[PDB]
């Protein structure tokens, strides 16, 4: 269920999350081909994140 961010990402809107390279994303569920939903542990931010910006741990 855990992923690691490989690049920084800045949320475009309220439903996305922001994160930094190296952040762990947990409780990840897949939404579609482009997008997952999960929580950036370090900030507590939960929401949509682009799948290309993370990798499964």
From Swiss-Prot:
GO molecular function: actin filament binding; cadherin binding; metal ion binding; monoatomic ion transmembrane transporter activity
Domain called SH3: residue spans: 1-57
Keywords from the UniProt entry: Acetylation, Actin-binding, Cytoplasm, Cytoskeleton, Ion transport, LIM domain, Metal-binding, Methylation, Phosphoprotein, Repeat, SH3 domain, Transport, Zinc
GO cellular-component term (any): cytoplasm
GO BP, sorted A to Z: monoatomic ion transport
Localization terms from the record: Cytoplasm, Cell cortex; Cytoplasm, Cytoskeleton
Keyword Zinc annotated: yes
Subunit-level organization: Interacts with F-actin. Interacts with ANKRD54. Interacts with KBTBD10.
Record-given protein name: LIM and SH3 domain protein 1
Organism: Homo sapiens (Human)
């Amino acid at each position: 269920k855990r992923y690691r961010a490989v690049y920084d990402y800045s949320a475009a809107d309220e439903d996305e999350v922001s994160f930094q390279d190296g952040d762990t994303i947990v409780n990840v569920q897949q939404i579609d081909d482009g997008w997952m939903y999960g929580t950036v542990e370090r900030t507590g931010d939960t929401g949509m994140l682009p799948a290309n910006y993370v990798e499964a741990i």
